[PDB]
Amino acid sequence: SIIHEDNEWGIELVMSKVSFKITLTSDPRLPYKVLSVPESTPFTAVLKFAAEEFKVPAATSAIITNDGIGINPAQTAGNVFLKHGSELRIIP
């Protein structure tokens, strides 16, 4: 959120990241993916990226906590990390 007046060259600030370990619990191997995500990333995009990694449809998948708590995807990844930590499940 620092305003750069004249950035003609297109320099970008790389944002702080949060990491999630996401397990596909419908597969008996319990495969997991660890995603490193810029903090402001909408959680909808994390769901999409995870679903693509597991080759399941994003439209019919949801991410929940390891305690079974639903996660409103209309939130930033940073806020999801602060509230729920890193250990998440992807499910139908």
Residue numbers in the entry: -13 to 78
The authors write:
The modification of proteins by ubiquitin-fold modifier 1 (UFM1) is implicated in many human diseases. Prior to conjugation, UFM1 undergoes activation by its cognate activating enzyme, UBA5. UBA5 is a non-canonical E1 activating enzyme that possesses an adenylation domain but lacks a distinct cysteine domain. Binding of UBA5 to UFM1 is mediated via an amino acid sequence, known as the UFM1-interacting sequence (UIS), located outside the adenylation domain that is required for UFM1 activation.
We fused the UIS to the N-terminus of UFM1 and used this protein to provide structural insight into how the UIS binds UFM1. To that end we determined the crystal structure of that protein at 2 Å resolution. Crystals contained two molecules of the UIS-UFM1 fusion in the P4322 asymmetric unit where the UIS from molecule A interacts non-covalently with the UFM1 of molecule B. Interestingly, the UIS of molecule B does not interact with the UFM1 of molecule A, but with the UFM1 of a symmetry–related fusion molecule. Two asymmetric units comprising four molecules form a round structure where each molecule binds one molecule via its UIS part and another molecule via its UFM1 part. The UIS binds to UFM1 on the opposite side of the C-terminal surface of UFM1 and adopts a U-shaped structure with Trp 341 sitting at the base of the U-shape. Upon binding to UFM1, the UIS buries 1148 Å2 of total surface area. Ile 343 of the UBA5 UIS occupies a hydrophobic cleft on the UFM1 surface composed of Phe 35, Leu 21, Val 23 and Val 32, while Leu 345 binds another hydrophobic patch composed of Leu 21 and Phe 35 of UFM1. In this structure His 336 interacts with UFM1 Glu 38 & 39 and mutating these residues perturbs binding. Indeed, mutating this histidine to alanine decreases binding to UFM1 as well as activation of UFM1.
